Paper text:
Attempts to co-crystallize XerH with suicide versions of the native difH sequence were unsuccessful, but palindromic difHLP suicide substrates gave us crystals that diffracted to 2.4 Å. Most strikingly, the difH DNA is now strongly bent. The bend mainly originates from a single distortion within the central region of difH: bases A17’ and G18’ are un-stacked with a 90° tilt, which introduces a kink resulting in asymmetric bending of the DNA (insert in Figure 4B). Each subunit is rotated by ~22° in the post-cleavage structure, resulting in major rewiring of the inter-subunit interactions and an overall compaction of the complex. At the same time, helices αN and αO of molecule A are rotated by ~30°, bringing the catalytic Y344 to a suitable position to attack one strand on each difHLP DNA forming a covalent phosphotyrosyl bond (left). Interestingly, despite the symmetry of the palindromic difHLP substrate, the two bound XerH molecules (A and B) are in different conformations. Their overall structures are similar (r.m.s. deviation 0.78 Å for Cα carbons), but important protein segments that contain catalytic residues (the β2-β3 turn with K239, and αN-αO carrying Y344) are in different conformations. Consequently, subunit A assumes a fully active conformation, while subunit B is in an inactive conformation with the catalytic tyrosine distant from the scissile phosphate. In the active subunit (molecule A, left), R213, H309, R312, and H335 make hydrogen bonds with the scissile phosphate (orange), K239 contacts the base of the adjacent nucleotide A12, and Y344 is covalently attached to the DNA.
Numbering used by the authors:
A (entry chain A), C (entry chain A): 1 to 89, 98 to 361
B (entry chain B), D (entry chain B): 0 to 161, 168 to 361
Amino acid sequence: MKHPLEELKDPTENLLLWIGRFLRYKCTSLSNSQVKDQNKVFECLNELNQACSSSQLEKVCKKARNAGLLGINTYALPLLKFHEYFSKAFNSLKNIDEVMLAEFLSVYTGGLSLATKKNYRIALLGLFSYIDKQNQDENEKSYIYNITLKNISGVNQSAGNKLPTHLNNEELEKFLESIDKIEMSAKVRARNRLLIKIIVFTGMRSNEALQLKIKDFTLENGCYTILIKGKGDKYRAVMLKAFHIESLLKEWLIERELYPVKNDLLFCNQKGSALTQAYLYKQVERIINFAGLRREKNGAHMLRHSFATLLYQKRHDLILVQEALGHASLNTSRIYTHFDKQRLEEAASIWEE
Amino acid sequence: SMKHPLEELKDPTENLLLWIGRFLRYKCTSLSNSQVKDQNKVFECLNELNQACSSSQLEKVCKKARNAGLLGINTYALPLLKFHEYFSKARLITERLAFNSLKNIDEVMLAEFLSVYTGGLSLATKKNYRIALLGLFSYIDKQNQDENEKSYIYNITLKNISGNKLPTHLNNEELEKFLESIDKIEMSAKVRARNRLLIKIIVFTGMRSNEALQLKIKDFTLENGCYTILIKGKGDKYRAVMLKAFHIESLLKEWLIERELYPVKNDLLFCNQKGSALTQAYLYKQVERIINFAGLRREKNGAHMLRHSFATLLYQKRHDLILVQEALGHASLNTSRIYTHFDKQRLEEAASIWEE
Amino acid sequence: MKHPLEELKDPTENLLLWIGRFLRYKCTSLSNSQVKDQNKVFECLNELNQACSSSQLEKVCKKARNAGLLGINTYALPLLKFHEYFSKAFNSLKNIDEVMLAEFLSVYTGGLSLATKKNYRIALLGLFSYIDKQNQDENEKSYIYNITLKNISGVNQSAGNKLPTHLNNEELEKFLESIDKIEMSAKVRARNRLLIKIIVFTGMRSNEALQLKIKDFTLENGCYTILIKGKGDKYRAVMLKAFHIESLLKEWLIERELYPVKNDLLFCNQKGSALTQAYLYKQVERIINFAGLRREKNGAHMLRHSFATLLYQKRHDLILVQEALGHASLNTSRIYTHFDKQRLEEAASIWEE
Amino acid sequence: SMKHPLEELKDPTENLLLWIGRFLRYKCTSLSNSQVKDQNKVFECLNELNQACSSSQLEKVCKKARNAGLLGINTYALPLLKFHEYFSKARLITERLAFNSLKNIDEVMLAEFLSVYTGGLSLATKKNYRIALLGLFSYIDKQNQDENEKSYIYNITLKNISGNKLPTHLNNEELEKFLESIDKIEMSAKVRARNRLLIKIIVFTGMRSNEALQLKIKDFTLENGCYTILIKGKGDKYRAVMLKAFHIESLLKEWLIERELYPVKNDLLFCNQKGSALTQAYLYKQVERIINFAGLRREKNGAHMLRHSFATLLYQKRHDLILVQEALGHASLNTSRIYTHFDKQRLEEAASIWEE
DNA sequence: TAGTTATGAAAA
DNA sequence: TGCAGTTTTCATAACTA
DNA sequence: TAGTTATGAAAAC
DNA sequence: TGCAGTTTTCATAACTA
DNA sequence: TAGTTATGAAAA
DNA sequence: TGCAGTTTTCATAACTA
DNA sequence: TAGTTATGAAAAC
DNA sequence: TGCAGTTTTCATAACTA
Ligand SMILES: [Cl-]
Ligand SMILES: [Cl-]
C-alpha cells in the first residue's frame, strides 16, 4: 500500500521512515543466493519495520549482509549518510531537489573514488524513485521528485572507467613460477597452489573457484571441462588442459580424504567448509609481492582480468572472451580490446615510416 | 480534446474499457504504418475505435488494423483486453477491494493478473504483456485530467520478468545439407525454379522473410560477379547485402524466363500466379518442408532460423561481430549476439592460449 | 515581447496567430543567401503581421520562397495543414498534446514518405517550442507544452534512412559515354555537356555548378582547381584533371563570347543569367533515360551520390570523401561506407570456404 | 532549502547577484573535482559563496576554487559577473525599462550584453559566455519558488553564435625538424635529460599536457620493445597508448638515473627539484622555446599543437579516424576530426579516381 | 494444386 | 546485468479459385 | 526552341 | 552521438517571345 | 636558474 | 548542419628560493 | 598455524 | 547504447582454539 509523503511532524524521522521502507523493499528483491540461513533474513525483514533510528537500520543491514544478503551494502550506508546530512543541516521533504543532492555528493563522496560516487548516486536514484511510486496522501495526490541527477560529474560511463589492472604475458608466467617457488606449509601447499593455478588458467571468479564441486569436473582427451554453478540452477563451463594441474590435482585429492569435506567441495578448510575470499586474497597477494608484481590491484580478480586480456591478445575473438569469462554483456568483454597490442601497434608504428 | 477525467463512468469496468480503447487508438496513430497497403483502412479503424464501447468491438477493430498492415497493434490489444476481462470478472465475482474503482489498480493487482493469465506462456510473451500494461497506465497518467485540471497518478513500474532446448540454428555441415536438400527435394515444375531461388537467397544473405518476399529486380545490381542487393529492412532500416552470382546465376535466369508468363506487379522478383507477393505462410511451409525432408527439424524451423545460421557461420569465419551487425542490420553487438551461436567445444581454443 | 497564450476568443484564430509569429520569426533567422531582392522579403515580413487568415500566410510564404527565402517552405505548408486539422476538428490551445499531434501526423502524412513525416514533426516541434518561449499572460504565468514527440514511428535516424540512389563504376562510364552520344542542338551541346561532365567528375551540387565563376578556375600541371563559393564569403575547392574537359571547355568559352553573360558566370542562358535547376534536371534525366539507367532518382544530385560512392570505393578515405564532397559532418560522409564492396565481400565470401 | 522566491530583495541588482552566487556554488558541487588536491579548499569555497553578497567576493572565491583544482568554475564565473556589471551599470546609468526588475530580463537583453562585452573576442569565447548565461537562468527557472509554490519562467534560449589563419599543426617534415631541434637546442645539464624525454613522449603519443606531467613509472609496461602506457585522461577517461622503446630507451635510462637524486613524490616520472609535478607553464615555455628555435612558430605553439600534429600524421599514415579516436581518447569521429588536418593538395587523389 | 487470410504466441 | 519499447516472424488452422 | 517560374514533396545537409 | 534544426534538390506542371 | 602561481582567453 | 555543456590548454604576466 | 568474520570502499557485472 | 540497477570483490582489521 501507499503512504502519504509526509506522515510525521519531523521530516528527519519521515526521511528515516522512507529509507527503512526502501531498504526493506530491496531486501526482498535483491538476490539471496549467498544467504546461508533464510531465517536471519526473515528476522531482518520485520526488524526494518520496527526500526525507528539510523543506528537500528545500519545494525540490521549489517546483520543481513553478514547473513548472505550482500547487495544491501550498496544501498544502506550511502542512504544513511544522506539522512545524517539531512538531519544535521529544511522544514519539509519537498525541499529535497537535485541541487541539494549535488551538495551532499560533493561533501560526502569528495574524497572517494568515482566508482563509489556512482554507487551513492544510484542509491539516491532508487530511494527517491521508490518514494515517487509509493507516496499518496489522503487527498489521493502524490508528490513526484523525478530525480535523475544528470548534471553530476563522473556519473556516466567512460567517466572514471578505470581500465582493469592486470598482468601481461610475461608477468603471468612469472606469477605462475612464483606459485611453485614461494614457500608454503605442507598442510596447505598442494591445495592452495591448485586453487590459484585453476584461477589463473581459467580466469574464474573468486567465489566461483571456492565453490567448485568435484562432480563438475570432466576429463576428456587430456582436457578438463569444469562446470560452474551460476544463478538459478544454471551452469557455465570452462576448459583447462590436464597437464597444467594433473599431478597437483591428484596430490590434493589424496590429502583431501583426511578432511571432513562437505557438499562435494573440491577445496575446503580443516573444518570441511568452503574457503573464504579473505584467505584466498592473502594467499594470492603474498605471491604477487614475492614475484615483485604488486600494483593497483593484487587479488584473484586481477588474475581474472589478466586471463581475459591474454585471451583476446591471443585469439582476437570477442565472443570467445565472453563465453570463457562468463560475461552476460559484450560491453564487459569489449573492455579488454583496449589492450589490443596489434591495435596499439598500428598507431605507434607510424614513426617507423 | 484528447484529455478526459480519470473516472467519467459509474461503471469502473466500462471506464477501464474506455481508456484501453483510447490507448489502442493512440497506438494506431503512433505505431508504424509502413506495411499498410490502404491508409483508408487505418482511418476506418481510427473512427471505429471511437464508437467502440465494448471488448468485442476493440478486438475486431484491432484485428482489422493488424490484417490491414498495422502489425504492431497485435502486441498491445490482446494483453489489455485480457486484463479488462480480469478486472470485469473480479468485480462481478469478487465484490471486494480494488475492483470497485480503477483508482485502486496498483502493482499488486497487475502482478496477480500476469500470474493468472500468463501461466503456460514463454518469458518473452510474459514480457510483452508487462510492456503492454505499463504503456496503458503510462497513457492514462499522461491523459487523465478533471475539470479542475487535476490528475491522478498511477506511476506503475512493474518489476522485471525473471531444461536445455534443441538447437535454434544449422551449423556449417547442416547448412550444406540443407542447400543440397533444396535441390534434392521434389517440387512441381510450376514452382520449383521460383521457390528454390527464393530460399537460397535467404540462406546466402541472412535476409529476413518479408525482406525476401518484397524483393524487386531493381534492388539487384550486378558487377564483377557480385550482386549488391538493397534491402528495405525491419523498421524501414536500409542496408546493402552482397550475394556472389555463381550461387544463383543459372537459377535466376531460369526463373526470370518463367516470370515473363506471370502478371507481375510492382517489379517483384518473386510472386504468385496472381502476380502479387508471396506470403510468410507459404515461405514457412516451403522452408519447413525442406528442413523436415533433410531431417533437420529443431526448436525453430522457419526462414528466420536460417538467418540465425547465416550470422553464426559469418562470425565463425570472420570473428567480427560488427560485420554480422552490418549484414543483419543491427545497431548494437548485443542484438547481433542473439543470432550468433557459440559451440561449447570452442572453449578449448581458450584453454590452449597457454601452450603458444 | 511575449504575448499571452490565449489572447483571442477563437482558439483557431489564436493558433493562426502563433503560426504567423513563428513563420515571421523563421523568416528573420533562416538563410537569405538565395534572395535576389531583399525588398520583397522585407515586404513579406510585415505582411506576416497583418495576415489574419491561412490563405494569406500561405500566399506570403510562397512569395517569400519564390523570392529566394527557400527554407520557409519546410515550415509553412506543414503548420498550415495543422491549422486546417485543428479548425475542422477543442475549446482551448491547451488541449493540444502529443496525442493530438500523433493523430494529425497519421492523417496528414500517412501517405507521404518518412522523410516528409520528419519535416512535419520538426515543424511542429519548432512551433510549440517557440510558443513555450514567447507566451506569458497578465499574471506573469506561462503555459509550457514541452512537446518532444518521441513516441512517433520513423522519426529518429536509421528510420527511413534510404541509402542514396546512385550509379556504380560501370553505370557511370555508360552515363559519361551517353553524354557525348545523345543528340543535342548545336546551340546548347557544348555548354550542357561541359556542365554535366563537371558535375559527374567532381560530385558538385546543382546550384554549386550553376553558379560557377571563371575566375575561380585555376589550371596547374594539367589539373584544374575549382573554387566554389559557400556561405558567408567562404570558398571550398575541388580538383579535376584537365583532359576530361579541356577541349570541351575551350569550345564553350568561344561560344560564350556571343552571350550577354553577367557576373563572370561560366554557364548561362541566352539572357546571360544563370541556368535553373529545372533545366539542369531535365538535361540530366533525358541522358539517364537514353542510357537506360533510370531509377529511383534521376537528377544531378544522384550523380553527386555516385561520385561520393566511387571515391570511397577507390580510396577508402573518409576524410577525403568529406573534403571532396564538401560535407560539414562526417555523419554524411560515413553514409557511403554502406556500399563498400571490399566490406560486403568479406561477408558474401564465407560460402567459398 | 535550496529553493527561494525569485525576488527576495528590493534591489534587483543585489538579487541578481544573489542568484549568480547560488548558481556558481551549485557548479562547485557538480563540476569535476578530480584536479582538487585538498577537498577542504572546496568546502571553504562552498561556505564563502554563501556568505558572499558582492561581486568582489564571488570573483575571489571562484578564483580560489580554480586555483585549488576546481578548474571548471572559470568558464561560468567571469561571464556572469560581467553580466551583473552590465545589469548594475545599466540600472544606475539608464533609469528605464528592464533594469528595474530581473523579471524583465529576456533574450533581447542577453543579446545586447553579448554584443557589448564580447566585441574583440573569438567565436569560441562568445560561445562560452552564451552557455554560461543559459546555465544561470536555467538554474533560476528550476530553483525559484515563492510562498505559494509558484515559480517564474524565463525559458531563455539564445540563438547560436554564427581571413585565413596560420597552420595549427606540424606536417610530416616539420615534425621531423622539431624532433631534431629537441636534441639540437641547448639545455642545462640539470634539465636536459628530463625535458627532452618529456616533450618527446608527448610528440610520439599525442598525449595531453597534464596527462604527460602526471605520468607515473607504474604507468609504463615494457614488452618486446613496446611501452604500453596507461593514461588517466581528460574527464577521467582511461586509455592505453603505445610507444616504441627505441625512441626513448637511452633517454629514459639517463633521466631515471638523475631522478634518483630527486625527492620524487607519488612515483612521478617527471618532477621539479622539489619532487613535485611540473606545471603547464613550464612545459609550454619549454615547447615554445624549441618551436621558436626551429622557426616553426604558427597559430598555436604549445604541446597541444603537437597533439594535433600526432593525429594528423596518424590519419595520414593509416586513413583510420577510429584509430585516431582511440589514440586521442574521443567518443566521436567529429571530435577527432578537429585534430586531423587535411592538406588541400590531396584533392588530386580524388581527381585521379577516374584514371584507374 | 498453389497458395491465401487470420491469429495467439514468441521473439527481435 | 538487462532493460527501454517498437516491429517483426513463428507456426500453425482453415480455406479455395 | 531554349529555357523559365512555381510547387508539394523528399531529401540533404 | 543522435538528434533538432536548416538548407537544397526532386520532379513535374504550365508555360512562352 | 629553474621553475612557480595566477589568469582572461580559447578551445576541446 | 551544428549543437548539448563539462573540462581542458593557450599564453602569457609577475615572481623567486 | 590456518584460517575466520566484519567492513567501508571499489568495483564488476 | 548508455544507462539504472544488481551482484561481487578489494583489502584490511581483529581476531583465535
Ligand atoms: Cl558482463
Ligand atoms: Cl554534411
